[PDB]
Amino acid sequence: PSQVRQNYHQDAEAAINRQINLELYASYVYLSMSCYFDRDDVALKNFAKYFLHQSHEEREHAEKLMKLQNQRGGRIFLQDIKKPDRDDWESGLNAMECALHLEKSVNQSLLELHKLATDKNDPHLCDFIETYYLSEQVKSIKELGDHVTNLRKMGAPEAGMAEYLFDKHTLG
Amino acid sequence: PSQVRQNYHQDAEAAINRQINLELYASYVYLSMSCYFDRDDVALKNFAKYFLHQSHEEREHAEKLMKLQNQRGGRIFLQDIKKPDRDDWESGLNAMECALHLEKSVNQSLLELHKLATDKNDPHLCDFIETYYLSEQVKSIKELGDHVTNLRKMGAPEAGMAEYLFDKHTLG
Amino acid sequence: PSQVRQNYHQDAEAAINRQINLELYASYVYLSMSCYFDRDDVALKNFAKYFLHQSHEEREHAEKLMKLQNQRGGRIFLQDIKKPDRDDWESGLNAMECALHLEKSVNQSLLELHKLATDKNDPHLCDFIETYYLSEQVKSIKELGDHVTNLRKMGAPEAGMAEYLFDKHTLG
Amino acid sequence: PSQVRQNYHQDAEAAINRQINLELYASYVYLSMSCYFDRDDVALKNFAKYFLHQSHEEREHAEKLMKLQNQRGGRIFLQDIKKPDRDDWESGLNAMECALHLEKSVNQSLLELHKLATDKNDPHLCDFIETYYLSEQVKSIKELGDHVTNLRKMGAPEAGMAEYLFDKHTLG
């Protein structure tokens, strides 16, 4: 194989490629959400900024995984980026709920990847996942849960003022 | 004609004079709106500031058209500036809706002017309209649509807090 | 339709959505190229940096088109991002040649979009395409052609020193 | 034993002492390489600087392991530092290849040490190895593989200009 490859199982390499695809898909979903909130009949600028930032950070995570794959001697094999499940996210509260579900699914994939790396005795891959992905995922999940709780308390989406004031005070 | 006139049809010159009058009328309408929100029984200072700024920008657009007319060798022929349709604009939401209708009417006049300039093969006039008027009009229309959407969501004008909080957070 | 929509044909809206997908695809292709040059058996850091920058600029172009679609009252409908045609780009010279072909294909799509917007008498869309996309595309095509010419002159990829010195002096 | 010793198996302590000796040996090998490139009939100053820096960093790694051994209550037992396998490294390309083999052997020893620490349930030792040694080793291996690939492409050592230009552009 590659001259630098050492203690890098093919199963881990394939799982890393799958995780790259999942991160790109999550970036795409966040881009779709941000474009939803930019609509003239939605018009929540701070929601759009929040989700655009989320999309960019997801792209950064995917590129970091790509760098990890090249650095361990693996070979990156890209796949199609699937379109998001919907183009109409219907509310700020529903978009935050969908983002929470998406981040938890990404976390579950990362935990399966860590279990695979632990089984193959790849401590570098395990430490990489723990240091750069698991803590960030847990923080993101907690932040989204806080957002969903606050939006639910204020009466969103039935209360019209709730999403507006949340956009101004929390995301502003 | 004028020593500088070249590829400047009389139809374009008359249409430019009409557009000057329309821009002055829009400035006058915005001034009337700003004076409405300065009333002691309305008292929305940021609404008044927003519409006064809009009035000043329409005046600047009219003066730029005047400079264009003199620069191409045309002769400016002024007309009466008609009074606005009403002095009581009844709410922030109704004023934003009327502003949206007004900006769209100005956009329609600009599009007709661009079609006339295209038909007469006046690329300088076409490029001038595209560079200084059409993009600004589209941005203004999108901004007003966003304002109307947000005010409608918050329950304006039936919800008393909606126009106040919109004045503080969006226009403040 | 949307409260802000004016002089925006449905054909133009669909073509804009297609162009968004094409820009995202080109960003993906550039990401694949950048990951190719980061491999340990390729190891051309400035090539990888160049193509990563190209990917990021393509993503920015796609987001600008998304903003344009929302600003004119259109509705963004996303599609799957197809995977690039290959994961092994085989040389710096072949990657630059493929990038040249890709940029020319994007230019051809932009020219078809401009012809459609001209036929529908949408001067705002025409001016938007000319101001933000056509000049950048022409500059990018000229730059890539210059790169391909220089790499061909130096004997790439048969001459081993050529791609290395081009990486150091032109892309460095 | 020592008043501070807790969850520190004797096997781990002996393995740490062996790793200290291996790091000192690698520092010595890098010093020999740097002295080879300082010769008047070799005269590659940036190669010598690169390998001298590698020697110093290896010495730093050994001293950090010594601090870890004293901090966990272990006792450092030093051994003879074996001389390098050769004094004539014959080329820049051969020296980089030997450095790659050496770093991979050090990585293999570190992975065996991590497996031993995992088996003894010493999470502090495991985390120490992952945080300070495994990532640095992987980065060093990738860097050396990149260097070897680039030198091989440019025609080293048969092409006389290759090692000179690599010394100037990559190591300079």
d(CA D84, CA D33): 9
Instruction: Check: CB of residue C106 under 8 Å from CB of residue C26.
Output: yes
Query: And the tokens for A134?
Result: 């698991």
C81 three-class SS: strand
Question: CA D19 to CA D110: how far, in whole Å?
Answer: 8
Choose among A73, A50, A74, A71: nearest CA to A132.
A71
Only one residue has tokens 């709780």, namely A149
Any CB–CB contact under 8 A between D124 and chain A?
A: no
Output the CA angle D24-D25-D27, nearest 5 degrees. 65
The nearest CA of chain B is from the CA of A155 a distance in Å of 12
Q: Which of A5, A8, A40, A89 would you mutate first to test chain C, the one with the most C CBs within 10 A?
A: A40
Question: Would you give the DSSP letter of residue A84?
Answer: P
A149: its two tokens:
């709780």
Distance CA A99, CA A102 (A): 5
Contacts of C140 (CB under 8 A, 6+ apart): C103
Q: Closest approach of chain C CAs to the CA of D136, in angstroms?
A: 16
Cβ of A83 within 8 Å of Cβ of C83? The answer is no
Q: Is position C137 annotated in a ligand binding site?
A: yes
Task: Using a CB–CB cutoff of 8 Å, tell me whether C135 touches chain B.
Answer: no
Cα Dmax for chain D: 61
CA-based nearest residue to B37, from B53, B20, B22: B53
Which long-range contacts link A67-70 to residues 24+ away (Cβ below 8 Å)?
A: A67/C38, A68/A16, A68/A125, A68/A128, A69/A13, A69/A16, A69/A17, A69/A20, A70/C35, A70/C38, A70/C39, A70/C40, A70/D142
Q: Residue D2: which residues within 8 A CB-CB, separation 6 or more?
A: D73, D74, D75
- Which amino acid type is present at position D47? F
Closest chain C residue to the Cα of B102, Cα to Cα: C4
Closest Cα in chain A, distance from residue D68 (Å): 19
From the CB of residue A9, how many other CB atoms can be counted at a distance below 10 Å? 16
Using left for φ > 0, alpha for ψ between -120 and 50, and beta otherwise, residue C73 falls in left
What are residue B68's phi and psi, to 5 degrees? -65, -45
Q: Does A72 touch chain D (CB under 8 A)?
A: yes
Q: How many CA atoms lie within 13 A of B104 on its CB side?
A: 19
| CB-based contact, C160 to chain D, within 8 Å | yes
By three-state DSSP, how is residue C76 classified? coil
Q: What is the 3-state secondary structure (H, E, C) of D10-31?
A: HHHHHHHHHHHHHHHHHHHHHH
**Residue among C82, C104, C76, C106 nearest C16 (CA):** C76
Q: What are C81's strand-pairing partners?
A: A81
> Is the peptide bond between A157 and the residue preceding it cis, with omega within 30 degrees of 0?
yes
Hey, of A40, A93, A169, which one would you mutate to test binding to chain B, going by the most B CBs within 10 A of its CB? A40
Contact B42, B109 (CB under 8 A): no
Cis peptide before D157 (omega within 30 of 0): yes
Q: Which of C24, C39, C84 sits opposite A78 (nearest CB)?
A: C84
- Which residue is it, tokens 């005047």? B66
Residue in B closest to C73 by C-alpha: B142
Paired tokens of D170: 């990559």
Compute the distance between CA of residue A36 and CA of residue A47 in angstroms, rounded to an integer.
9
- Architecture of domain C10-170 in CATH? Up-down Bundle (1.20)
CA B124 – CA B71 distance, rounded (Å): 11
Q: Where are the domains of chain A?
A: 10-170
Which of B89, C82, B30, A130 lies closest to D131 in space, CA to CA? A130
Backbone region of residue A90 per phi and psi (left: phi > 0; alpha: psi in -120 to 50; beta: other values): left
CB B153 within 8 Å of CB A164: yes
How far is CA B37 from its chain centroid?
Answer: 18
Q: Which of A159, A130, A120 is nearest to A14 (CA)?
A: A120
Q: How far is CA B157 from each of CA A161, B37, B51, B151, B154, rounded to the nearest angstrom?
A: 13, 14, 18, 8, 9
- Nearest one of C95, C81, C132, C89 to C110, comparing CA atoms: C132
For residue C171, give the nearest of C81, C50, C9, C35 by alpha carbon.
C50
Please give the Cα distance from B145 to A43 (Å, whole number).
9
Of B18, B139, B138, B155, nearest to B76 by C-alpha is B18
**Sequence-distant (≥ 6) Cβ neighbours of residue C115 within 8 angstroms:** none
φ, ψ (nearest 5 deg) of residue A81: -90, 115
CA–CA dist A91, C157 (Å, integer)? 54
Is B153 in Cβ contact with A160 (below 8 Å)?
yes
Please tell me whether residue A81 adopts helix, strand or coil conformation. strand
* Structure determination method: cryo-EM
